[model samples]
Target: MEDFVRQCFNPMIVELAEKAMKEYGEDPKIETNKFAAICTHLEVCFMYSDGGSKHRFEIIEGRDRTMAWTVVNSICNTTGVEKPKFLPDLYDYKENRFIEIGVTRREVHTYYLEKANKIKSEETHIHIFSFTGEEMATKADYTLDEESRARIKTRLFTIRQEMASRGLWDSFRQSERAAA
Candidate 1:
């Protein structure tokens, strides 16, 4: 993982740091490393996954406010776009674990409602609602088969599309291009 970060991730960070510094009237050579370090630390939080779920990204205990504010200010100042909040988790009944769908409830609701409209089945609504933890009282005990998995994955991808449309996903490059 460290090797992967060095070879792939660090280069991208350097490039962004250089671009941001240049655009912001700062010397890239002087501040690029510091900027890259801050950005890399933020990225590391979301780097790993377990059982198809990403590890939650949070500020370290003691530095929560300071670190969080620093990250917010750094990205916003450099890229001219506010960093998006961490995506919410959804309880997967079949997997018996919470999965970070990497989208807000509003995003999920829009996609799931569209799906529910298409399917037009009571069970489909129940399953989707339960999976999203909207109706926690009624836990739908059902295993996700191949078709279900495919549908869920499609929903995930759809939400990513929505995120991209709103400039929430991959905001760094998108915002950079916009600023340029």
Candidate 2:
């Protein structure tokens, strides 16, 4: 079980978690770029890329923020782009996210939504993180044998059960109740 969480995914996350816990408290947000990083302290850091961007030499040469959300459909190893078309980086601002769909792994993120007023600069915190998914393993690297799939299924379900005990099963019904 530890092997799945420690070595299977990006190893850097568990490395950073020890230190990242201090400043941000234990609830630090995280995002992961690679599939192998099941244990990284960070979640998936994602941005929208132009349709023509892939053919281009540089990955970040032309990225879009507003268009990022639409790309979600393409990230979970789905869509016309083929495997790993999109990588999702998650930060603690939300639930724990898994590179694997349906699994929520905690990400390392911090923010002040009130910062929305600023135009953009060092003084402003975008609450955004930039990272490369270069470390995540490719789909071809790991075989789709039934043993691996069964193990994943077992672990995913077990994790869900463990998290539910922590009162984590509630819906994310974010509202403007602060104004209320």
Candidate 3:
């Protein structure tokens, strides 16, 4: 409940370089380093982590989900590295296993956070591909108290207001219909 923006404001964006590699490690379906798309998806995680949403990417900004990751090996091509993965949304109440999709959209991460927020459990793990081609993981407590949730909610409200003031808020929330 303290200084939400001060504590969780800007997410670090690592500059990357193009590297076309296959089977980096356990994840076999590896591709090239598309720094731009990497930045897009990375920003999604950072935004949500900062109480913001990627609604701008799909709806407000007229961007497509598939377009970002379409650059084949679309990895982060810069001096450093990284790309990320998250669990897919549930269709029914049955399948609960984390499903990894090829090209991750902003909605996917949003929904994942939604599920995470509902957890009254112990820990939830989030992963990242570090710039050094290393897998990094962080564990979070799902059982956030009301005060914590309120803090994030307040930050989200402020974020929306600022975006609207800047003339960037999308009211209807229509997504770009391009195929992945």
Candidate 4:
């Protein structure tokens, strides 16, 4: 497990995380972007190493002051697009349609509802993450399969090793740790 986790963090991932974290209190967008940056680093790392078997993936651009969900879809390389069908960098690999990730604040919730309504897919999946105790695993209307979820968690756990060693990982847990 340690070896597997080690494979996920490169100088680039660490550099990005550190850069993002360092910008706190300076950039207005730092809080949300820091999480997005970490998520991006973890996702890229997992898709490259920790991901089992053959899979193709793309990134969902992160935003600030919102849910900031980066919805990555792992696709088969064989999935092809028609010559004239130009998909932007963020299109869903399987559906080739724009999709909403989830809600955050009230304003973002309104935005999410608009997109979900516009898309109107019955299988629409919504993800909600609660940072409170025992809610680290994101709650979702439609969740990833066990293997997929495990893969994500493994990558996240692996990336956290670097943060822990740097004495950064406990920041989010200070209050909870104090409560105990």
TM-score of each: 0.22, 0.26, 0.28, 0.37
Ranking by TM-score: 4, 3, 2, 1
Worst 10 residues of 4 by lDDT: 129-138
lDDT of 1 by residue, 1-180 (tens): 222223434575545544545655776445433343333433322231222334322222113444546654554466444333432122233333322222223334454554444434332212232223231111443233345444544544543455456554464234333432
Q: Any residue pairs clashing in model 1, and if so which?
A: none
Tens-digit per-residue lDDT, 84-167, candidate 4? 111112333444433233212223344345545554555333332222211121133223345654555454455456556656
Off by over 4 Å in 1: 1-9, 45-180
RMSD of 4: 10.1
After superposition, which runs of candidate 3 have C-alpha atoms over 4 Å from their true positions? 1-142, 176-180
RMSD of each: 19.0, 15.4, 16.4, 10.1
Q: By TM-score, is 1 or 3 better?
A: 3
**Model 1 — which ten-residue stretch has the worst lDDT?**
129-138
Residue-level lDDT for 176 in candidate 2: 18
Name the TM-score of candidate 2: 0.26
**What shift in Å separates residue 36 of candidate 2 from its native position after superposition?**
15
Model 2: how far residue 121 lies from native, Å = 35
The models' CA-based lDDT, in order, is 0.37, 0.29, 0.29, 0.37
